[PDB]
Design a protein around this nucleic acid. Structure first.
Lengths: 261, 614, 261, 261
DNA sequence: CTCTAGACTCGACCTAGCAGATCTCGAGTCTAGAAATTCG
DNA sequence: CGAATTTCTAGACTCGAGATCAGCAGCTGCTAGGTCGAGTCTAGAG
């Protein structure tokens, strides 16, 4: 029987919004290492993966590994009525049929239990590759989202261009053109309010702003977002889940059509 | 349609050969119609279709008429140059373009403006834009330029684009020519009638205009009654009454007075009377019954224009003074003279006697018995009430019970099935149509005897107008009786002659109101007259001719005659929750007086489920 | 070659807010003595005037007179993407159809520059009839915003009566009638509380309430509004932009017979 | 000459919005004892009663007991003009059909006056029987505010099975069932968190949650609900209006027979 | 013998449709913009 | 105090029913159906 007590339920709470608009069904690979999640997006374009170490949990123990599925949509509506400073004690029995909620209160005066119906999914595992990237960018995550919705007004395609002194965010729409560049600043002691880009080889790609808007949903996970880019490689947008874990995104680059011809 | 090309052209080419037609049209209008004549044959169709269509600005982009060409536009500019299809051109009228304008782009134009609630319904948006006419104090704020509505219509045209419309003159002249042709389709083979047009109906070209003015109004008032908006009708009817008042002293109606009653059918006063007649039901429905009482009084002063009108006003006074404006002292005076007026007869009057009986029995008028001692009587002998059953929806189980199929029907088959198995196979129904059909063939040339003025006024007439009026018979009182008594003495074989002959002599030839389907087979008709003969139908027609206005129908619905066994089974279809009207047996009483076989057929309310109970 | 740099970019942000929807297209007339904007609405009903001086600009130079037409909506899309504290670096090139909008970071870390297409309007030499107004009312902008907004629901027009005892706002509708009047401030020395009224002769006029909402969008610009009236003269609403200039709202009175028919 | 002067305008603000969604018109039974409202709902299912003691008003007077039928819907919009801290001055005069509302700013610098139109409503009186109940609980208002809402996601028919050790406010639906059980608390220093229950006989009945959501609109009025129940007797939901009045709600229990159908 | 309330009846009273396709439309539903709120 | 969160509100999209149109129906009177005030029958009390 699996029990996971998490003092910081807010971290668990705010995960679901990022996965709502892009994921509906998923499987939770649960082991003694912690909580794992891999699920291809509904549109079969971008890949979203989640990992949590067990050591982050206040209480955690899992005798036998389980891969079980629940609709993401249902669980967030349940988690809607919960508060941010509560104590949660995620618990699941061996025979995977229901999920019990052990919601607690900071004053330990009000407790509420809810029961979730589980469902079965086909465990489709895809082996992601691990490799070095050409241009890797770490920069304030809140700033990254702020850039996106400006360029969304112009078009749905931002030219990623790792340059000598930052990036060359360029949106090309029918109404006009939007070019945004940020100076590479590292002298700031506050690493959260700083950008660091490592140079291996310049590489230029373009991505659909539709997924970037969905990817920016995870902005308050961490104050900074790390972007790793490489030639003919899916986009990497990673969010560190404090010390609890990490959350990174895949999105295959669009094939550059021969519009010049 | 090839029908429309031949039809309108036939109308024109037939109305041409009338020297009065040219007499009542100016040389200008003559040039107009000739310049229609020289117009392209394929260019005729565009004006033909639009003429018999609503008068409103329409975009040719909306139009889809294809049988001329997908690109018949050159015909459009040609006919525009002809001076008929007023194109976008002179269009400085915001209301009309708003009418052309459709709601979606109307909503868009609302969006680009600031007006209050730019999401409403069609008309109030229209007059909201019309409130934008109230300006020239904020438009004159800088440079004067009062054409704010001009800007509105400019952007509307930018939204709308092109349109066309017909000038009033051509429409007016073709309206006049068509009503002249009508005078109270090309496939129709008209009868063997030649022509007898002698006297002109009207007296002046000015007089006919007022009919054209009135006819438009009369149709307008007709629509007003189907709206609930008689309030606008009265004001123009007041003007029409004022138009009457102005033209009350006009000699044109005196010649109509000189005209026979079948020519009196339409008269300046009479039109105005019928205008004022609708005014009464305008008045009564809005519950101004007292004026409606006043109108019929002045109506009752006049009797000449449609003598079959004074009786209606007698009922008007009774209805006005009973249902809502209970006023005894007049309504007794009314009902007395109402029962006495010659034009009040049959159902029109027999209802009044029962009305008199019903009124006198009431406690309200029970005091005035002394004024009710002149009551006539119509003692009846109600015909044997053969009360039958059968399924109702109606629904018939005709045929074997093994096949109780629905096959929706009417009350006829129920009795028909009952009577056909009663050895009365043939004979479907049709009140007095068949008797008129019998009357038609045998007396046709007597019916259509000519030489009398305006018997066949038009080039297309079938009935000589006076058919409705009793003066038809007075015209041929000697001629009819000679032919009438001959039929009375003619044997069955002789009847077959004039039936079959006139059936052929006037086959295809328009048979006025005569219905060929009444005689499904001509031999059947010849077999039908083999069952008929002499007094059987001769008694009927004696009643028919003079008492004609008030006796079109009411005869036994079913006719159910045995084809081979002579004996017929004439029937009045009836039943529970129903009864024979006062006039209804006036057919039967004299029918049974001549020993007709009318059989009152009541019908028990019997449903599909009901028979399963037994 | 025109180039004007204003430290307070929020002022340029606020001014578009009122003009964002009230006016759709206008000509940007610029002279060596300052900025002056003047155009008309699509309904030919109200006039907007700008009197931005050259003194208020931190750095100003306008080598030759320009009068250029640009879309109002396009500009508002750009003013929204700049913070309330960026330094505007407006720079317009001679007959080049390129407006250099640079949003300077007070932090001196981000660089924000934007250019937009230039359209072609037409000038109609709007006449400005200067005239004295019998009833002159100065009163705080915030209170003015309420009175116009509150009376919006009850009716569609207001009969303004310049009573010497205190101006009164009366509006009537199918719901009934409601009159609101104030008292001239005597002892409260605060300029954001004065209800001072200048009285020469009482005037009773009527105006459309569907526009007062639009004009009251300029409440963030200033704390006090000034309204002046007389017999048969347009409504004037003036906002004093510090020492930068004044903007005046023109509204010709509603005709008295419009309600009659 | 009816006059009622209450300083706390917000409480008068707070009472109207709760009444908007359930009643269209009602008869105002006012007396020297105070303001009393007895008005069964427009849906003809629930009953609402309101009584305001005269002494609760700062200044109350009532020469004659009037009973006016005023359109309930339009009242809030006029009230929406009133501020959260203005002194309301309810006042009626002779035989006219107008009610006088005056809103006074706390600084006495803004005086708002308004006038509405009275209608003729039949004075329909319904008998009010007084009796005891089976399950009576003093239970916090903000607590249930979610409870009606949270289980409104499950179904529309709760089966209350009040017992000796808390509540069993269960629900059910096609997606599942919502099962919340709150634990009875007595050792609480504050009375705003006490859920003390007095039991004589357990009762099991059923309601529709749609009304329950409507009955929760009066949450800002107080923080202590006096809802109670007995067998086959309509529900009572009473809110203490500070020391100003009492707001009671009536709703008959739903019969279990219709649930079978 | 007479006055009054309720059921059966009967006779008066009033109103829609014609004929299939065609737009046109008028309410019903959702989600983004607008805005209060509220907390560190 | 700013931003998120939630709510509110209006603008956009769906559907099914209402109105109209054209080449002909309207012959308008029988049929069905819902209605109403008066007449009539009966039961209980005087």
């Amino acid at each position: 029987m699996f029990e996971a007590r998490l003092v910081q339920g807010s971290i668990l709470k705010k995960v679901l919004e990022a996965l709502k608009d892009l994921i509906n069904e998923a499987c939770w690979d649960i082991s003694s290492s912690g909580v794992n999640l891999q699920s291809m997006d509904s549109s079969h374009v971008s890949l979203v993966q989640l990992t949590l170490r067990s050591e982050g949990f206040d209480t955690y123990r899992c005798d036998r590994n389980l891969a079980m599925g629940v609709n993401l949509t249902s669980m967030s509506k349940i988690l809607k009525c919960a508060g941010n400073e509560d104590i949660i004690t995620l618990r699941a029995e061996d025979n995977a049929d229901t999920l019990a909620l052990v919601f607690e209160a900071p004053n330990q005066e009000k407790v509420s239990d809810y029961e979730m119906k589980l469902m079965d999914l086909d465990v489709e595992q895809l082996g992601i590759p691990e490799q070095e990237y050409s241009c890797v960018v770490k920069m304030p995550s809140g700033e990254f989202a702020r850039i996106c919705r400006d360029l969304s007004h112009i078009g749905d395609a931002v030219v990623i261009s790792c340059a000598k002194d930052g990036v060359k965010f360029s949106a090309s729409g029918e109404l006009g053109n939007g070019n945004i560049k940020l100076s590479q600043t590292s002298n700031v002691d506050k690493e959260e309010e700083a950008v660091t880009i490592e140079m291996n080889e310049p590489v230029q790609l373009t991505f659909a702003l539709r997924y970037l808007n969905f990817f920016t949903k995870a902005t308050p996970l961490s104050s900074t977002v790390t972007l790793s880019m490489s030639a003919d490689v899916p986009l990497v947008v990673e969010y560190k889940i404090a010390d609890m874990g990490h959350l990174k995104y895949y999105l295959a680059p669009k094939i550059e059509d021969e519009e010049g011809s | 349609h090839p029908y429309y090309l031949r039809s309108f052209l036939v109308v024109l080419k037939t109305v041409l050969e009338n020297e009065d037609d040219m007499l009542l049209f100016d040389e200008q209008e003559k040039g107009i119609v000739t310049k229609f004549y020289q117009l392209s044959a394929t260019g005729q169709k565009l004006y033909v279709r639009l003429f018999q269509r609503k008068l409103s600005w329409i975009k040719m982009t909306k139009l889809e008429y294809e049988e001329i060409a997908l690109d018949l536009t050159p015909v459009i500019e040609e006919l525009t140059n002809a001076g008929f299809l007023q194109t976008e051109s002179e269009l400085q009228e915001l209301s009309e373009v708003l009418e052309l304008l459709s709601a979606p782009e109307l909503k868009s134009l609302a969006k680009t403006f600031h007006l209050v609630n730019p999401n409403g319904q069609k008309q109030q948006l229209v007059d909201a834009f019309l409130k934008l006419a109230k300006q020239h104090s904020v438009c004159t704020w800088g440079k004067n330029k009062p054409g704010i509505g001009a800007v509105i219509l400019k952007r509307a045209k930018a939204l709308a684009g092109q349109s066309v419309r017909i000038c009033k003159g051509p429409r007016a002249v073709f309206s006049r020519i068509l009503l002249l042709f009508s005078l109270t389709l090309g496939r129709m083979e008209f009868p063997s009638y030649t022509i007898n047009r002698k006297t002109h109906i009207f007296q002046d070209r000015d007089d006919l205009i007022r009919y054209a003015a009135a006819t438009h109004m009369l149709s307008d008032i007709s629509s007003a009654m189907a709206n609930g908006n008689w309030e606008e009708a009265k004001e123009l009817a007041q003007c029409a009454k004022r138009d009457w008042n102005r033209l009350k002293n006009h000699p044109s109606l005196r010649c109509h007075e000189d005209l026979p009653l079948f020519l009196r059918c339409f008269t300046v006063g009479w039109i105005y009377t019928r205008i004022l007649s609708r005014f009464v039901e305008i008045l009564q429905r809005l519950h101004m019954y007292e004026e409606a009482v006043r109108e019929l009084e002045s109506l009752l002063s006049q009797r000449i224009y449609c003598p079959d009108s004074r009786g209606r006003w007698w009922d008007r006074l009774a209805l006005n003074l009973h249902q809502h404006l209970k006023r005894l002292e007049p309504t007794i005076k009314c009902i007395t003279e109402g029962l006495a007026d010659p034009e009040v007869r049959t159902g029109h009057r027999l209802s009044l006697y029962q009305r008199a009986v019903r009124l006198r029995e009431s406690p309200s008028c029970k005091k005035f018995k002394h004024l009710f001692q002149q009551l006539p009587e119509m003692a009846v002998q109600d015909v044997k009430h053969v009360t039958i059953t059968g399924r109702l929806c109606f629904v018939m189980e005709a045929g074997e019970a093994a096949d109780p199929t629905t096959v929706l029907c009417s009350v006829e088959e129920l009795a028909l099935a009952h009577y056909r198995r009663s050895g009365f196979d043939q004979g479907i129904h049709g009140e007095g149509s068949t008797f008129s059909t019998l009357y038609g063939l045998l007396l046709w040339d007597i019916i259509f005897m000519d030489g009398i003025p305006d018997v066949f006024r038009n080039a297309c007439q079938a009935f000589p107008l006076d058919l409705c009026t009793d003066s038809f018979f007075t015209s041929r009182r000697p001629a009819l009786e000679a032919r009438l008594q001959l039929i009375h003495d003619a044997p069955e074989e002789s009847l077959r002659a004039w039936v079959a002959a006139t059936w052929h002599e006037q086959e295809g030839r328009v048979a006025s109101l005569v219905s060929w389907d009444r005689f499904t087979s001509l031999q059947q008709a010849q077999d039908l007259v083999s069952c008929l003969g002499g007094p059987v139908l001769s008694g009927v027609c004696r009643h028919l001719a003079a008492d004609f206005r008030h006796c079109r129908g009411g005869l036994p619905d079913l006719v159910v005659w045995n084809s081979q066994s002579r004996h017929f089974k004439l029937v009045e279809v009836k039943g529970p929750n129903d009864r024979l009207s006062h006039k209804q047996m006036i057919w039967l009483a004299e029918l049974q007086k001549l020993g007709a076989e009318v059989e009152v057929c009541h019908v028990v309310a019997v449903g599909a489920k009901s028979q399963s109970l037994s």
